[PDB]
Amino acid sequence: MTDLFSSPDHTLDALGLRCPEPVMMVRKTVRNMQPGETLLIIADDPATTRDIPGFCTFMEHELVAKETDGLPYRYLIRKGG
Numbered sequence: 001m002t003d004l005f006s007s008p009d010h011t012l013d014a015l016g017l018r019c020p021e022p023v024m025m026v027r028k029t030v031r032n033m034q035p036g037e038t039l040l041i042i043a044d045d046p047a048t049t050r051d052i053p054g055f056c057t058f059m060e061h062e063l064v065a066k067e068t069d070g071l072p073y074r075y076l077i078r079k080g081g
Helices: 021-032 048-058
Strands: 010-012 039-043 062-067 073-078
Touching: 010 021, 021 039, 021 048, 039 048, 048 062, 048 073
Parallel strands: 010 039
Antiparallel strands: 039 073, 062 073
């Protein structure tokens, strides 16, 4: 397993954030992100592990690396389409 969470191009705190707030931060970040880039995202909210990423997948983004080894969760997402 290689480390894909390397220094990402962007970040999204979602610890204490809850849908749609977190999924929302990735949205605006997705709007300011570029295809071929990366965004690390943390989330302690239980609805972010499912909504934040479920959102990136819906906008044509990529989940570069997920983290569920125990809250807070984390997920990298390479902006793209």
